[PDB]
Amino acid sequence: NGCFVDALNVVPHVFLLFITFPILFIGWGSTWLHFPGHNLRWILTFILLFVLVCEIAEGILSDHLHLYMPAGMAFMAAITSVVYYHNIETSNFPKLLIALLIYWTLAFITKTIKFVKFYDHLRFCLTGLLVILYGMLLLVEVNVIRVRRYIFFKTPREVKPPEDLQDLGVRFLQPFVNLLSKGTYWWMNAFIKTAHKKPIDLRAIGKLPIAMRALTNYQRLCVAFDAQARKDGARAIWRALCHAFGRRLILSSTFRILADLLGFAGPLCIFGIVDHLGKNAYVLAVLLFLALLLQRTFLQASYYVAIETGINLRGAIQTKIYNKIMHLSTSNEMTAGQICNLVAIDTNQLMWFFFLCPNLWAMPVQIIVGVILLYYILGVSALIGAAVIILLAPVQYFVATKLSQAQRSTLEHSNERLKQTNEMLRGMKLLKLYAWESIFCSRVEVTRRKEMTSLRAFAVYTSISIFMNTAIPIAAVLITFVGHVSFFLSPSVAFASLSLFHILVTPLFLLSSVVRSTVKALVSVQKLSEFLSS
Amino acid sequence: RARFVSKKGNCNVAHKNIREQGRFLQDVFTTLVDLKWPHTLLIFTMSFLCSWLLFAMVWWLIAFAHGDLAPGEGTNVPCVTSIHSFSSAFLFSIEVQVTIGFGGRMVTEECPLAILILIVQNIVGLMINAIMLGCIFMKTAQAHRRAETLIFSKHAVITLRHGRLCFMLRVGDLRKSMIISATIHMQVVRKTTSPEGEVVPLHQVDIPMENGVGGNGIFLVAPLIIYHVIDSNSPLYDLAPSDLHHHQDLEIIVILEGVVETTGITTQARTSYLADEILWGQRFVPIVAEEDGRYSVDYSKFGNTIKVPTPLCTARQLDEDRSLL
Amino acid sequence: RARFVSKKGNCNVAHKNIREQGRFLQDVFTTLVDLKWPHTLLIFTMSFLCSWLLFAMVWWLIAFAHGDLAPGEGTNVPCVTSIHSFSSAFLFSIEVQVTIGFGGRMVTEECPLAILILIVQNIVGLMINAIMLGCIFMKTAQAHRRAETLIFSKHAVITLRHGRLCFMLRVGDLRKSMIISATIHMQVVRKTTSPEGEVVPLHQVDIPMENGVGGNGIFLVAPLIIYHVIDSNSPLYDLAPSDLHHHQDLEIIVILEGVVETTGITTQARTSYLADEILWGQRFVPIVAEEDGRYSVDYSKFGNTIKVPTPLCTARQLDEDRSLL
Amino acid sequence: IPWRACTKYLSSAGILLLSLLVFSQLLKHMVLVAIDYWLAKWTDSDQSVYAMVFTLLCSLGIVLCLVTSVTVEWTGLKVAKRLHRSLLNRIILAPMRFFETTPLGSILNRFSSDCNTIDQHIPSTLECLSRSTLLCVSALTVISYVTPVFLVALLPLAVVCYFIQKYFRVASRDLQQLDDTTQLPLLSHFAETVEGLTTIRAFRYEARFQQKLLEYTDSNNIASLFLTAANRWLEVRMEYIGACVVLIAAATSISNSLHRELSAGLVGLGLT
Ligand SMILES: Nc1ncnc2c1ncn2[C@@H]1O[C@H](COP(=O)(O)OP(=O)(O)OP(O)(O)=S)[C@@H](O)[C@H]1O
Ligand SMILES: Nc1ncnc2c1ncn2[C@@H]1O[C@H](COP(=O)(O)OP(=O)(O)OP(O)(O)=S)[C@@H](O)[C@H]1O
């Protein structure tokens, strides 16, 4: 009785979609309360979305409406569960939660019946995954009733919605929104729309949450520094920062590596589609869509978490070196300029290096996966190509260094020019009282030519950089395809190689800047340690 | 500048940081009886269609499960005679739910499970019909529209009556139907600083309406100018006539309450007059006129105003001059 | 210690030895319209099922008695065509009662007794349907939930305003919908002994709410601190500031009444403040703030309080010092 | 900023190099698309002649790229030269009362930075903007040619981007300048503490000054944080649309170019 069990599955989705509509229509016609398992709930809901897409794929492969309707109904049921949970996060209730719990139990029952009747005789894996996900969501609901007040004894002892991010006027609410918007930044729609009309200012801007201030980051950093110095330096301050900023950085890094994996994965499903049509493809197309959106979302969340950790670190070490400025001795002009450079360039170097920290961990796995993937698509010839592109990464670094050198020289000349100007724009009446102005303008132009001369070499190096940027992508395909067929090709192979070439060219440039930033940050932290410990 | 309550009678102050404990939905039907008509009609049709589709699905399933859905001649009688597909099942659901009872498809005495589904279908249908009638009727006692028909003059003037400064404002009715026992609560708001150093952002204070021996309420047949006399005890008594037009921030609101005749509900109307809306030293034009055998009221001159040669000075200084004259 | 009425607004005093003369049930529907929703829904389904089963039994019996129940071909026509067993009879009862009218089983013009049973079945059905709709609608005018949405600050403070001792308490609204003509009845209770040797266990006395020229009522848009001034005539005027926090037993309750707009019913809210809840010499933080073009109200500071350097002394001794200063 | 500033900037270069830059860029992008267009016909299977044509296209691409880069370099340097000389000459012939009226900071500052800023960043950023816009136009034209119908589906979404553009800039500029402002009094404050350090440690005013510095660093962080939040917003939304377009392109390619079109060399270019 397969159709019978299909209908029995369709029923509970219908029940929930029908109870959701009155409440959703009343709610559709400023305190955020969060419950334990919220993030777990949303993660599991996205996994449900994915498995439901797979079930729809199965239903397309089989076709019999009644045989693939259960997926199309669970889709709206999960979306309506999301709508319910949004309506509960916005206003708490003990009853709406039970309304979810009933549906979870009934869906679990129907899935169990499906599993048994299948065991007695692709479907197997999908049904099992759905069973596991529904069970985990059930356990989450049981946790929620165990926490505060589903039925439990009389009073919830309810939390008292968090005043950190919800009390008196604050505008940057990142930690206090729905875990979907924590990814897609939906809370910025209101800000940006209001910003279009009225000019933004510090009165129109928010105030930083208690999760990120000078005091909070300074407290964590000084606690780590204390726990490290009680066990007694450059390595000490380093490990102190490391243990102080902890989980956020590694979380960003793992977001980043998973995104890198899915990005390396995209072109392979492209390849599969191209193969299938030349000789099971709509599924690959929708999977490509899903993988693209998920990969890019994870990449962006990674960027943001890293940036926020870096901003925390900048605030922390800034207020710390200001705290040190109070206890220093008078015997230690040049030190003042060194101090203000220690805040204007050294701290910015530290913070931008902390921006680029997760990229330094995620780059090697990216190039490794790239080379191993292209080898299995083009064979030995691939290896040759895989060399050429990689050879651009060290060369780039060299080029960059030359730029820096040039920059230094140019800056020198520029400074001198400014001096020869500051006089003329002060002795104005003196200058024009006898018209010696052209005589000084000749000298000013004499300086300018030297400045121009430096700029030629700088722009030549810039030109070489821009040239290599788009030359190596062409050269890779040239020396690879000519060196593969006519030396040693379905459209899929060539186009997958093209995609991988671009997906590998994009990260390669960043490794050079990462290396420069890392060495400069190491030097700047040695400097900060020498200063902070005088 | 910011206004307290708008001219139309709606409230301006936007609320922030409401610790919602859920009472906003806990008022389940006293919430939606507030709504507009399109939303309420939408949610009523959605209630009805939701219930109908739910039971149509369960009936489709029960006819499928009994096996009466499998087209076969003999050896059975369907629990519901003449049922073939989902469409006819949904037709049966709407046939029994909303109590039309077509009877082309007959539920039979062979299956007691169908008896149970019917005996719950009908009671839930009747309960949701009962609430969806009571709440729409509780709605049609929305008489705020009768709060719309009342009107006040756009700006209010002050004058000198009986040797004392006075302020005059108009009101009036717009239909034949009277409003029972209307009362006037006339209030003034101002950012005030106490002698104790306490500053309030807004300070409501009652200014009396001056009728016979006492009384808070009035009788509305024709447009009646409401007549208060500011005295040294009154809170408004201290201001100056040249500082009101531009700078000062003084909202004078009036709240007229009263129960309409036919529905019996108690409605009210609220309006504000700003420091830039009010003006000084004028007089309204007489509306009522002895016509052929009755009193004709002309609403064209309702907001009309004539100049009057009255002295212009502050009520404090005017009281000091009354002490001098 | 024992409280008079609880914070939630429910009454605490448990009644004992009520000479029940039966009026508790004599209010038959004004009793059950008070009940919760599950109990009222239970008793409504039980009313309906009771009536349906009663008439299904009597119909089963009448078809049995006529002999039309005895399956036979010819020499008769059943009073109700196509009736076989009790199940089909109960199906006929629910078919004619709740006015679906399936018509598979036809009541015929051969037996006038069946005509009588139908002509009483339908009228009793219609009457019990009429009451079971009117009472559920009379229920959906439960607006006590709107008595839930109102809020008062947890504790009340006293201050010195205009050179005289004052007590300040907050109130406020939680929805867009206004409350018409709300009035404040502010009462104090205390175990009192008269000079005649009479001791009362509890003694309610009105303490005035101090508005403009008079008036018992207020206007609620934004959170308005209610402002009373205790004077030598006031009953609360005699207490001491150090004896209130721990020992004395003084409940100050406030009862705010008002009719909600949309339903028109008159609701109220009641709250108590104990001698241990109230505190001395403080000031609330200003809620209302001039935002972009409006007034923003922040309910986070609703219950917030700041210290104020005010003299601490008894109102009697403070009045004596005012006589001295 | 209007087109007049850029018009004067490029007219200082002259008609000699303007077209030499623009047409060379157009031709480089045309070669970069045509190589893949010919590879599309290369795929299905004269393989040797095909590979030789591929080699010819690959050589044309790199030669043209080198030419374009050298053009941008030479033009930028000439423009900087002429602009500096003209600025100096025009400042020389000014009346004395003009020099006395205008503060020294503004007159000196333009030469100090404007000149430096332009020389350091205008050529590279201009080259990058040109390459980006032409690559985007080329990609749109490719996915249009590959799918006759996909074109008609992509013009709606692109119009969406227009609405995403305005709302971004009118804020992204604003926040930007705010950042600059919160950076200026902070650093200066630091310096004030260093010089008058003895006075501040004597008055025992260390607490209030530390409070002020926490205030300033918070005002800096809120700005530098909202800026990255807005950049993330624009990024994610533009990316969601860039994924919608590839979804629609692949969905049209699998059916149109296989079922009825019966062409496989198309879907490759479009998907890639
Ligand atoms: N314990 C009680 N509980 C509730 N109601 C009562 C009670 N006692 C009396 N009543 C009613 O309320 C009124 C109070 O009057 P009472 O105290 O009973 O004096 P009474 O003269 O004895 O009147 P009775 O008891 O009816 S003969 C009476 O009229 C009763 O009807
Ligand atoms: N921001 C708010 N919005 C709406 N209602 C509130 C808010 N804060 C409190 N309430 C309710 O109204 C009353 C005001 O008292 P409060 O200012 O909260 O003092 P409280 O002692 O902290 O009481 P709590 O918050 O319930 S422990 C409380 O009893 C709350 O139930």
Author numbering:
A (entry chain B): 24 to 52, 63 to 96, 103 to 160, 167 to 277, 283 to 329, 354 to 406, 411 to 566, 571 to 616
B (entry chain A), C (entry chain C): 32 to 356
D (entry chain B): 996 to 1040, 1060 to 1286
Verbatim from the authors:
ATP-sensitive potassium channels (KATP) are ion channels that selectively allow potassium ions to permeate the cell. Specifically, they are inhibited by ATP and activated by Mg-ADP. Previous studies have established that the functional KATP channel is a hetero-octamer composed of four inward-rectifying potassium channel 6 (Kir6) subunits and four sulfonylurea receptor (SUR) regulatory subunits. KATP channels in pancreatic islets are composed of Kir6.2 channel subunits and SUR1 regulatory subunits.
The second structure is the KATP channel in complex with ATPγS alone, which is solved to 4.4 Å resolution (abbreviated, ATP state). Therefore, we applied ATPγS, a slowly hydrolyzable and functional ATP analog, to stabilize the structures of the KATP channel with and without GBM. The overall KATP channel structure and SUR1 conformation in the ATP + GBM state is almost identical to that in the ATP state based on our density maps. In contrast, this density is not present in the ATP state, where GBM was not supplied into the sample. Therefore, we compared the density maps around lasso motif between the ATP state and the ATP + GBM state, and found that the extra density near the lasso motif in the previous medium resolution map is present in both states. With improved resolution and map quality, we found that this extra density was contributed by both the M5-Lh1 loop and an unknown ligand, probably a lipid head group that constitutively binds KATP, because it is also present in the Mg-ADP state described later. We observed a similar density in the map of the ATP state structure. In the sample preparation procedure, we added 2 mmol/L ethylenediaminetetraacetic acid (EDTA) to avoid the activation effect of ATPγS by chelating divalent ions. Therefore, we observed an Mg-independent ATP binding site in the degenerate site on the NBD1 of SUR1.
